[PDB]
Design a protein around this ligand. Sequence first.
Ligand SMILES: *[C@@H]1O[C@H](CO)[C@@H](O)[C@H](O)[C@H]1NC(C)=O
Ligand SMILES: *[C@@H]1O[C@H](CO)[C@@H](O)[C@H](O)[C@H]1NC(C)=O
Ligand SMILES: *[C@@H]1O[C@H](CO)[C@@H](O)[C@H](O)[C@H]1NC(C)=O
Ligand SMILES: *[C@@H]1O[C@H](CO)[C@@H](O)[C@H](O)[C@H]1NC(C)=O
Ligand SMILES: *[C@@H]1O[C@H](CO)[C@@H](O)[C@H](O)[C@H]1NC(C)=O
Ligand SMILES: *[C@@H]1O[C@H](CO)[C@@H](O)[C@H](O)[C@H]1NC(C)=O
Ligand SMILES: *[C@@H]1O[C@H](CO)[C@@H](O)[C@H](O)[C@H]1NC(C)=O
Lengths: 201, 596
Amino acid sequence: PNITNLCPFGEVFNATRFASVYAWNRKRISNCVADYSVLYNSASFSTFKCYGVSPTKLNDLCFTNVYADSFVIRGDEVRQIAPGQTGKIADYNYKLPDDFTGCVIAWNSNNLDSKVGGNYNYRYRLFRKSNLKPFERDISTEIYQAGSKPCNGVEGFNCYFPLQSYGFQPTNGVGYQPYRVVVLSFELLHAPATVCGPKKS
Amino acid sequence: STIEEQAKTFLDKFNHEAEDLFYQSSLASWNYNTNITEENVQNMNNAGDKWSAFLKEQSTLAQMYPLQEIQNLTVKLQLQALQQNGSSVLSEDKSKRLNTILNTMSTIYSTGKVCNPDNPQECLLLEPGLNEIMANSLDYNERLWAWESWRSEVGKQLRPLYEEYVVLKNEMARANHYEDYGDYWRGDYEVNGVDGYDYSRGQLIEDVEHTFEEIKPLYEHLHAYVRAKLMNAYPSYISPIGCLPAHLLGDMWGRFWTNLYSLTVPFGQKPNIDVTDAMVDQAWDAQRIFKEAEKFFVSVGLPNMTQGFWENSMLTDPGNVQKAVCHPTAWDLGKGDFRILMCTKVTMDDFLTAHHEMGHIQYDMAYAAQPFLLRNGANEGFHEAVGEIMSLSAATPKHLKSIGLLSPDFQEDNETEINFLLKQALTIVGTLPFTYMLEKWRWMVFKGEIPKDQWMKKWWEMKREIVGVVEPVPHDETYCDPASLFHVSNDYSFIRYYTRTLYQFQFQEALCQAAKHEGPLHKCDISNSTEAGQKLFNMLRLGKSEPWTLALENVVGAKNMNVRPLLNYFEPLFTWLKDQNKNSFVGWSTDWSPYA
Ligand SMILES: *[C@@H]1O[C@H](CO)[C@@H](O)[C@H](O)[C@H]1NC(C)=O
Ligand SMILES: *[C@@H]1O[C@H](CO)[C@@H](O)[C@H](O)[C@H]1NC(C)=O
Ligand SMILES: *[C@@H]1O[C@H](CO)[C@@H](O)[C@H](O)[C@H]1NC(C)=O
Ligand SMILES: *[C@@H]1O[C@H](CO)[C@@H](O)[C@H](O)[C@H]1NC(C)=O
Ligand SMILES: *[C@@H]1O[C@H](CO)[C@@H](O)[C@H](O)[C@H]1NC(C)=O
Ligand SMILES: *[C@@H]1O[C@H](CO)[C@@H](O)[C@H](O)[C@H]1NC(C)=O
Ligand SMILES: *[C@@H]1O[C@H](CO)[C@@H](O)[C@H](O)[C@H]1NC(C)=O
């Protein structure tokens, strides 16, 4: 059968602006045809690490829904987007489950997300009382209490603001350059699976 | 909850908001250095003021966490570094007076112009007007005139200023729980809290004297040989039994003896190892020089330079329209940005300098994983030593033959090794008594052992006793002869060169033993050895996280600075000098026998 209504991967990968890692965008992709070979055959991605499934059989399998989480992190923090990892991003910003099925795609964005004066529009949660659950979003802006003393609302001594900005310059090293990360999460639920791969003739 | 967790969160907050500010300050400094314009000066000053104010505010917040309730060594080290008052403990009036004194000394040294009386229409500055005269002239009275005139003008201007400087610095140091300013400088080598690896501030002077006592026979033989050659060059001024005249050492102050290689060459008939013509014939660009240095560092196993290094560094002089500082400097700007600012020419010296500065870059890159306030060398000596070892290894004839710059049929006989070792001794061994005497004199001045009215009578007495250099004419207390040098006039520690020199050969013996070199130490090359690079990188990766004693254990297997690798390096030269000094008299007399 002739196939149309392809999945909206243009609005995730080719977005003009990406979200901050504290407020990572989640897009639910359903009832369309997902061509994953366009992404896999691209040479523009630095990390294409798939956990729980292989890229070759993605174009054959069918899934109920696809979750596309999009955010921006540093070069040295891409390793923390993996199951079982520990760091600022994993504990306080974006937590991946151990039993995760999907792919983590990351690419360098020094061209767009870095300006000569410094791009400070991207923020990360530096302190939280407890670690995040998998696929949890924390957009709270309440002052972190590191000491028994009551913070009382003001950022003074032992009480810090949890969201800290990121500094992006075009002359930075590859471990400090901004990297756009799109994490695709594939789940199979009891409902009939509608995100199927293209059928070859 | 606990104090240690509070300090850890505070240190995280510091490292995060301090790396970006340091990057802004460093980038502004880079923009000033590659582009000397008044707006760039203003931007640099604004960034520096923001950086200093932020450090003051963070230190003020940092002091509220007591040191004795923290057990983690890294957290304690960062808190110790942050909690230092510095000049903040002193009163605002005295702090402003101290800053004004430092700035005016900087201007007096930098803009000091001296010329001959009765001919004042034009005058010569120190660089390069006086440097070339001191390094190349063979006339006794001309060098005497230049030396005495520069110490007359600079010392008479700087003597009250230095008298105020010592008192203010002592006041700040005693306000900061130190005995004197010398104890403050010696506190860089202080290690506390580690069992067995502890190092005291008082142990540094004892170790320096103990090492110098072993340095002294080699220096005495070298001094006798230099005295005989200078006696040949100047027939009547130099005495066989006395010290060397001060203005004849080839430099303005006596810091290096490398300008006497032409006068004191052992075998002039034999060729040199100059490779400048070979690079000129093959059209070696500065980019090729840095690529060959990169090839050397990948040969030993270290990581190669980043793309940002090649894109953002200035490795050639920009041009007439754009002004830049010509001094070669390796910049660790922060956030993984490493650059080299060098006006590279096609010379051997620039090639070795490229290796030295890329060694500085490699050292800076290695501790990038460490927290921000621990991103330094373990002491002031290691940072220079890791560049000097690359300078040592790259200058060897085996390295030059390996990279094609030297002919494969070049004859390496003993005579070339002797003259090369003598040049290395004039550069390296000759600076050690001057450095030790200068630091010991400054430590005694800060300690109050020498009263202000007796500074020069002791100083020349020290110079005759240690350096074996006599004053041409007596100087009274109106002179300020030490402060004519760049480091002392601008508030810099001077013992780093002595520690660097000993650490250089200790590291060289350790890496050559790792690389399984089977010949003389000076013929050793650390290229192609992965294990030597791994042994070096184990110390390189630590940075300031671990004590310098533990780092030295990691490399050479010793818990203290040692003098034996230097003596082993110059052992062929030591035997040759002992053979050549049979007729002449080793040692000097402190009396006024040559001239006064
Ligand atoms: C996204 O951008 C790249 C580069 O401009 C382009 O080649 C590609 O076709 C775009 N779309 C997708 C779905 O990757
Ligand atoms: C140096 O400063 C001048 C001043 O106008 C500017 O025109 C030029 O572009 C600058 N060059 C660099 C390399 O920054
Ligand atoms: C000290 O703290 C660092 C992080 O702040 C931690 O990784 C390290 O294990 C600690 N050291 C000790 C001995 O607890
Ligand atoms: C720094 O100075 C302040 C005020 O003079 C003092 O309270 C503090 O103890 C000093 N810091 C140290 C480490 O002594
Ligand atoms: C640096 O080394 C890596 C791996 O050894 C290599 O891929 C890269 O091309 C090198 N960089 C340059 C500029 O040659
Ligand atoms: C160099 O070696 C030759 C050959 O043994 C010897 O005759 C000569 O004395 C040596 N010279 C020096 C300075 O070692
Ligand atoms: C080190 O390795 C390079 C790469 O093959 C080689 O050309 C060079 O000759 C080696 N050095 C020595 C001393 O053999």
